[PDB]
């Protein structure tokens, strides 16, 4: 349900984290 | 083995509290601080301060003497004689 949209913003966070942080 | 339901027995006490988002976190801090800080420092000062004051005198004198007795190379006994 809300998990896609929430999994997609959790997705994005990891990505931007790595990208930036690394 | 449970710490919250087993502490102690309390009867007849009512408690009123308010939510963080309804209140302010910094309640007339300058005003309270000055008076409260003032009031407890002044009840501390007498109990606390002394000994430190003491030390300071000891320090001061203590160092004077050293420098004297040692810098006063002639201190112990004079030159002319």
């Amino acid at each position: 349900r809300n998990w896609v949209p929430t999994a997609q913003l959790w997705g994005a966070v990891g990505a931007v984290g790595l990208v930036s942080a690394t | 083995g449970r710490q919250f339901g087993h502490l102690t027995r309390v009867r007849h006490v009512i408690t009123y509290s308010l939510s963080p988002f309804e209140q302010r976190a910094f309640p007339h801090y300058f005003s309270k601080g000055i008076p409260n800080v003032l009031r407890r420092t002044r009840a501390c000062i007498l109990r606390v301060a002394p000994p430190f004051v003491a030390f300071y005198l000891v320090y001061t004198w203590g160092t004077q003497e050293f420098e004297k007795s040692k810098r006063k190379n002639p201190a112990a006994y004079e030159n002319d004689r």
């Binding site: - | 006490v13 009123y16 308010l18 963080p20």
Partner: protein, 241 residues
């Protein structure tokens, strides 16, 4: 048990929390060490890495480090056939080994200036006031020739030849080589060899201080936010009594 005189808080560009080193000083000083001091005192942990630290280019210092390996070169280190080129070589040891070093200065052992600033008590001030401090022996005093009298040495006597004197060397730019003017530059280069991190660390200090001024207040609010309920709390006691 002789009184020891102590160094002024001599006016230094860097005395201050944010103040940093003045490389031109470094630069100058360097040459002072190299011409005035290389002769008896070593700097082992100093490589020919001034580049960015001293504003000498990599070509500039390469060259500067090449001639020092051509004359003092790795033939004093044990690289039989070594000559100009290398940059990982450290500043050239005045003598093969310490025992010799005392013989050249008659029993005394020229301290490695690498860390003098941070080693000996009293920092650059002492170093500056030593070099610049040389006065007349005190009425009724005796002095073996090596035992020059210096106003700032623990035992009130040092085995130090004219450390620095006017017009000892010449700098590229034209900085007036005064005994003292040179010592101001010499000390500074020493400060740096003692603590190469001097500038970076001060720079981070600034960053740490701004940040910390944003977190300390921020986190305090967070603390009141939560605990407010408790400190805003009021009580009532109503027995059946």
């Amino acid at each position: 048990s002789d009184l020891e005189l102590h160094p002024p808080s001599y006016p230094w560009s860097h005395r201050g929390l944010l103040s940093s080193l003045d490389h031109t000083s470094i630069r100058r000083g360097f040459q002072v060490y190299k011409q005035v001091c290389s002769s008896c005192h070593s700097m082992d942990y100093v490589a020919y890495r001034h580049l960015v630290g001293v504003c000498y280019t990599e070509d500039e210092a390469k060259a500067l480090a090449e001639e020092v390996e051509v004359q003092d070169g790795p033939n004093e280190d044990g690289e039989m056939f070594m000559r100009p080129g290398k940059l990982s070589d450290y500043f050239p040891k005045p003598y093969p080994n310490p025992e010799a070093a005392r013989a050249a200065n008659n029993g005394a052992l020229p301290p490695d200036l690498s860390y003098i600033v941070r080693a000996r008590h009293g920092g650059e001030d002492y170093v500056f006031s030593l070099l610049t401090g040389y006065c007349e022996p005190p009425t009724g005093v005796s002095l073996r020739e090596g035992l020059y009298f210096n106003p700032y040495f623990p035992g009130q006597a040092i085995g130090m030849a004219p450390p620095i004197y006017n017009e000892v060397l010449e700098f590229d730019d034209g900085t007036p080589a005064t005994m003292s003017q040179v010592a101001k530059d010499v000390c500074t280069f020493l400060r740096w060899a003692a603590e190469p991190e001097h500038d970076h660390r001060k720079r981070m200090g600034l960053k740490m201080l701004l940040m910390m001024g944003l977190l300390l207040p921020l986190v305090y609010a967070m603390k009141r936010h939560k605990w407010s309920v408790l400190k805003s709390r009021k009580l009532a006691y109503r027995p059946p009594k």
